[PDB]
Design a protein around this ligand. Sequence first.
Ligand SMILES: O=c1ccn([C@@H]2O[C@H](COP(=O)(O)OP(=O)(O)O)[C@@H](O)[C@H]2O)c(=O)[nH]1
Length: 435
Amino acid sequence: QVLLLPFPATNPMLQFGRRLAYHGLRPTLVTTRYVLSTTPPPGDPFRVAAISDGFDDASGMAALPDPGEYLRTLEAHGARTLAELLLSEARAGRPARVLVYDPHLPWARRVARAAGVATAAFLSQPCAVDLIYGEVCARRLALPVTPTDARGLYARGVLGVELGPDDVPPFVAAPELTPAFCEQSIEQFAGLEDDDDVLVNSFSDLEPKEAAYMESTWRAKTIGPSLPSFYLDDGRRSTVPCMEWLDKQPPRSVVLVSYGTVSTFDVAKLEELGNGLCNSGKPFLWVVRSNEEHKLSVQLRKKCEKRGLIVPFCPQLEVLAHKATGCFLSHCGWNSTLEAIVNGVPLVAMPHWADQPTISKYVESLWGMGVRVQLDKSGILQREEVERCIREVMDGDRKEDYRRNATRLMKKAKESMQEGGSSDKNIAEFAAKYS
Ligand SMILES: O=c1ccn([C@@H]2O[C@H](COP(=O)(O)OP(=O)(O)O)[C@@H](O)[C@H]2O)c(=O)[nH]1
């Protein structure tokens, strides 16, 4: 079997597993006992299997909100139970042919290699960010990484844009705001040189210098965007109520709003975001997660409820593919960004941390498919700014420029994953290797 081990939370690794199954491989999703008991399995063509993070009954992340402590606990129990799993699978007649793993779990590679199982690292961040972390891991850049260092990489043809202070990945530019995440970002690459394969959820045409560098440096092969085949127009509709609302809207009219599944916004930040949205005048679909809703006042919720819909969950790819969708106000997490690209949807970028500031810079300055919100002197996003950016992308002099670039990259993204495409060829090479 092909074992797939994402960070326990994913869809891009599952999408790659669907393609492996197309090619006659047998994928298994590996997740925590907790997650397996408290969510539906993926279904065919996948098996599922479980490891433990120490909290099979309760959410260990809830239980352990300090990141270092959670990660140390996940390693302890995860490495032991992943070892047990590799043995029990072999004994059950289903020995792992390869472990595909998120290298935010670097212990997974140690365990597999000790069990004699091939390993395939699966990076789901852009090549531009991954390569920066790698240069630190390899002791070619010291901490903190600076704009000066980034400029060197741009001048050497490794990075395709010059990253300023607000564009360098904060986990290495300002390490220690986030010590555990700094360590985790860099340790992805520690030992990656002994993996059998290295894979990245991107496409060459998007990040050509960075992909090329990742390939020559780390053997990384692009396999993305790792999304459902339907969205990539590769021939080899839901009933969710938000969709019915979207159906009634005019073409390219609606702002989708999401800051993702992980970041938390305080009451002040939700106030500026929600007021900016109302103040724009645009219809909007604002996904505010169940676990964040308590911070949204009645007043702000009802403020413009004749134009805007607030929901706890929307099928985002289906939303992005909808004719009524005009732009996406997004934190520009990588999955969000690729889903916007594959649907040709212009972006208003409101990054927080991790890969988002870098992504945002590429969005506005190389890809040209949107704009990034400008924070004021104290680093606060103002409602006037939120509104200005929405209006810039939906009504500016440059509105067709953002749409054109989004469309352009949509087509390249599709070409990459279709038969003959740069990503398709890498996926096929992997499937053959492990067949
Ligand atoms: O209401 C939602 C919110 C999120 N997603 C999906 O969950 C992921 C969000 O990931 P991203 O890398 O952009 O940032 P994160 O959530 O990890 O910060 C993407 O696949 C989204 O399509 C969705 O379908 N509906």
